[PDB]
Amino acid sequence: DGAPPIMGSSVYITVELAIAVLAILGNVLVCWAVWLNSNLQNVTNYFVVSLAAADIAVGVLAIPFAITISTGFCAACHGCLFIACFVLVLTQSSIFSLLAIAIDRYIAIRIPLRYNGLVTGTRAKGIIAICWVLSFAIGLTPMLGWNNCGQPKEGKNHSQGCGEGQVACLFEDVVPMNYMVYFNFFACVLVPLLLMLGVYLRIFLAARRQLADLEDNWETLNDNLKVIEKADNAAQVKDALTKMRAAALDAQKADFRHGFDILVGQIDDALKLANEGKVKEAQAAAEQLKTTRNAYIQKYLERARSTLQKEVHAAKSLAIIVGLFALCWLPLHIINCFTFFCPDCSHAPLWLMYLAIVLSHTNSVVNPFIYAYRIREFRQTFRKIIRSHVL
Numbered sequence: 181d182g183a184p185p186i187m188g189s190s191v192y193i194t195v196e197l198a199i200a201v202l203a204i205l206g207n208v209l210v211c212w213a214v215w216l217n218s219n220l221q222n223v224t225n226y227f228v229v230s231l232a233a234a235d236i237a238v239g240v241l242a243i244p245f246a247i248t249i250s251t252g253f254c255a256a257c258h259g260c261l262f263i264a265c266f267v268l269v270l271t272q273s274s275i276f277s278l279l280a281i282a283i284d285r286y287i288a289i290r291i292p293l294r295y296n297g298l299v300t301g302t303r304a305k306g307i308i309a310i311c312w313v314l315s316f317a318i319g320l321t322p323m324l325g326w327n328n329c330g331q332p333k334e335g336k337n338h339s340q341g342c343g344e345g346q347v348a349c350l351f352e353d354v355v356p357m358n359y360m361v362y363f364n365f366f367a368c369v370l371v372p373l374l375l376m377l378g379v380y381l382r383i384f385l386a387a388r389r390q391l392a393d394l395e396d397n398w399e400t401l402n403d404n405l406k407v408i409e410k411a412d413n414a415a416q417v418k419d420a421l422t423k424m425r426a427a428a429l430d431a432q433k434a435d436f437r438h439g440f441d442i443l444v445g446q447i448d449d450a451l452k453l454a455n456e457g458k459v460k461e462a463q464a465a466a467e468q469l470k471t472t473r474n475a476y477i478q479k480y481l482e483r484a485r486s487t488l489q490k491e492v493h494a495a496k497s498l499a500i501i502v503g504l505f506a507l508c509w510l511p512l513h514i515i516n517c518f519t520f521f522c523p524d525c526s527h528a529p530l531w532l533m534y535l536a537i538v539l540s541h542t543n544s545v546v547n548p549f550i551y552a553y554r555i556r557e558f559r560q561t562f563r564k565i566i567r568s569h570v571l
């Protein structure tokens with residue numbers, strides 16, 4: 181006869197309430213910043229709002245649900261199922277939101293040309309609504325028959341003094357583990373994570389490929405120029421210039437038409453000269469190109485470089501969220517795995533179970549800090565609010 185469980189429950193409940201406090205405050209701040217700042221009103225941040233909404237729900241409902249379910253109190257089976265699986269609904273919502281963010285940034289970085297023509301607030305709202313609905317379908321799947329209401333714990337039901345029909349409300353007693361591992365973890369959680377990793381890999385790959393392409397064009401431009409200065413034949417000049425022309429109109433694909441028009445025009449003129457056997461005429465005419473480069477091309481390619489740097493930094497910041505999501509949630513899934521795939525093992529200790537539950541809950545508090553740390557716009561919007569209504 182050992183330590184009173186309420187002593188541990190005091191800690192657990194206090195920790196849970198603190199986590200709820202932070203989860204509500206941080207995410208409320210996020211939503212407020214997005215609502216009043218017009219720079220933060222794009223399709224990409226609407227998913228941020230949805231994620232923050234799920235986190236608010238965690239702080240308002242899932243945590244109280246966790247505190248209640250932990251009691252093992254007497255309630256009808258299906259009611260206990262809802263209480264236990266509402267967090268699954270929210271977690272699936274978060275999954276779909278993160279995956280939507282990844283796909284949005286992918287579409288933005290590979291085809292920004294037709295990004296707006298494809299991605300709008302209308303279709304985004306339709307997506308988010310469909311995502312919430314499918315999250316409900318997934319999370320509450322157990323209530324559609326895939327439960328253990330038909331296999332109750334006679335000993336427990338009669339120990340805790342429950343009514344006819346009712347059952348004690350614990351997780352592993354009503355929520356089947358094959359569902360948690362196969363259906364929820366392997367299919368509806370792990371696979372999405374693999375997909376997110378793939379998409380972000382493709383994002384960074386495309387950013388690197390574009391920077392190398394523009395760099396090859398820039399180097400082709402200047403190297404052909406140097407070749408002109410060193411060449412000693414009209415045909416050698418025209419060869420280098422034709423290839424410089426190709427590189428010029430290639431880098432063009434990356435107000436600004438003025439610069440590239442001047443460059444390509446100068447290249448056409450140098451070509452016409454070289455074709456008419458006019459060598460040094462071409463070498464001198466192609467020497468003014470560098471000015472056109474020092475006034476337009478360099479100024480455009482540095483700006484394209486900074487734009488890709490910004491999108492890369494944004495992709496990194498948005499991927500860190502998925503990282504923390506995985507790190508906070510996977511421990512419970514691993515615990516479920518070895519609660520399902522090892523009958524010869526000893527079950528994980530109760531303190532470790534609640535520790536992992538608390539950990540999974542902490543994910544609803546990190547996102548705002550990530551935003552304020554990484555994203556200048558979010559940071560300074562939070563700053564204004566913090567120095568607008570309350571200090």
Ligand SMILES: Nc1nc(NCCc2ccc(O)cc2)nc2nc(-c3ccco3)nn12
Nearest residue numbers: 350351352360512513515516519533537540
């Ligand atoms: N395995 C598990 N257990 C619990 N709570 C109850 C643990 C327990 C274990 C033994 C016992 O006699 C009474 C209760 N909550 C849990 N939540 C989750 C979870 C949430 C999201 C993914 O897995 N897994 N999970």
